């Protein structure tokens, strides 16, 4: 964010690696929970647009979510521009050119410009404005969740467990997800999503049941 020199200038300080590591941990752990939003807001306190983009690049592997954020950001930026039309005239020595939507998203603006806007009297709070757009995006992401690409693969009441396993793994293989997410899918979701009768059998197996043991256990259930 922004800090003052002993020589009095407002200068930029990169987000701490510990704040960044915390944010990446929140996303890893709190998948798409409403809980992500309040955390994002706490962790991004004081952030310039550059800092906010830094936080997002850190969780960019979530491509479907990043795509949703992009569309929200483009939409809000477009409305900002409608409300804040470009004015071609000269800028008075005591005025400051207003930011465009892309300046707020950090795309067409420099850190120096972001800081100049943020610390003006009164501010042009481009960090807070961009943060609101991101939050609009995050809310849309959580609200949409209720996915189908794995989560809605459920064993049928009369489905042979070997067929369910096949469907599950086929769906799994076609996804673009990190390995740690896929590991949770194979080790816990598969049982989680088995039918009532198979799940009860599966949950009564030992600590280290192999998938072949699982299929043996649930055969004709």
Curated annotation (Swiss-Prot):
Compartment(s) where it occurs, according to its Swiss-Prot or TrEMBL record: Virion
Annotated site, Cis/trans isomerization of proline peptide bond, chain positions: 89-90
Span list, region Dimerization/Multimerization of capsid protein p24: 145-221
Modified residues (Phosphoserine): 16
Renumbered residue ranges of the record's region Interaction with human PPIA/CYPA and NUP153: 57-95
Posttranslational mods: Phosphorylated possibly by host MAPK1; this phosphorylation is necessary for Pin1-mediated virion uncoating.
Subunit structure: Homodimer; the homodimer further multimerizes as homohexamers or homopentamers. Interacts with human PPIA/CYPA; This interaction stabilizes the capsid. Interacts with human NUP153. Interacts with host PDZD8; this interaction stabilizes the capsid. Interacts with monkey TRIM5; this interaction destabilizes the capsid.
Function of the protein: Forms the conical core that encapsulates the genomic RNA-nucleocapsid complex in the virion. Most core are conical, with only 7% tubular. The core is constituted by capsid protein hexamer subunits. The core is disassembled soon after virion entry. Host restriction factors such as TRIM5-alpha or TRIMCyp bind retroviral capsids and cause premature capsid disassembly, leading to blocks in reverse transcription. Capsid restriction by TRIM5 is one of the factors which restricts HIV-1 to the human species. Host PIN1 apparently facilitates the virion uncoating.
The protein's name in its UniProt record: Capsid protein p24
The organism of origin for this protein: Human immunodeficiency virus type 1 group M subtype B (isolate NY5) (HIV-1)
Whole sequence portion shown: 133 to 353 of 1435
